[PDB]
């Protein structure tokens, strides 16, 4: 009896996360006040199995 067992496994994972926060606030002597902020979060995950 002759048995040959060949097993090959491959796994790859790439995760990219980008977070951008931009805030601007101007406050005068109780006469003018403007505050703004913007947050952008992007996450991409890719998994490859074989």
């Amino acid at each position: 009896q002759e048995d040959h067992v060949r097993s090959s496994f491959l796994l790859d994972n790439q995760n990219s996360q980008n977070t951008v926060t931009a805030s601007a606030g101007i406050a005068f002597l109780n006469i003018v006040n403007f505050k703004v902020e913007t947050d952008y979060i992007s996450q991409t995950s890719l998994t490859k199995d074989y």
Binding site: S42, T44, L46
Partner: protein, 50 residues
């Protein structure tokens, strides 16, 4: 000798991933699926004695 030239259509879903880099600093690997109906023309012939 021209035996028969016809066409065949088949729809398949293809998954493709691209590494898009916006502003040369925001890089992300985005994968998208497209259902393409590919059409191919097949021409079968036959060789007779001249």
């Amino acid at each position: 000798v021209h035996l028969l030239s016809q066409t065949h259509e088949e729809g398949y879903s293809r998954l493709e991933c691209k590494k898009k880099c916006t502003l040369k600093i925001f890089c992300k690997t985005v994968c998208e699926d497209v259902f393409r109906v590919a059409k191919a023309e097949f021409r079968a012939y036959w060789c007779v004695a001249a």
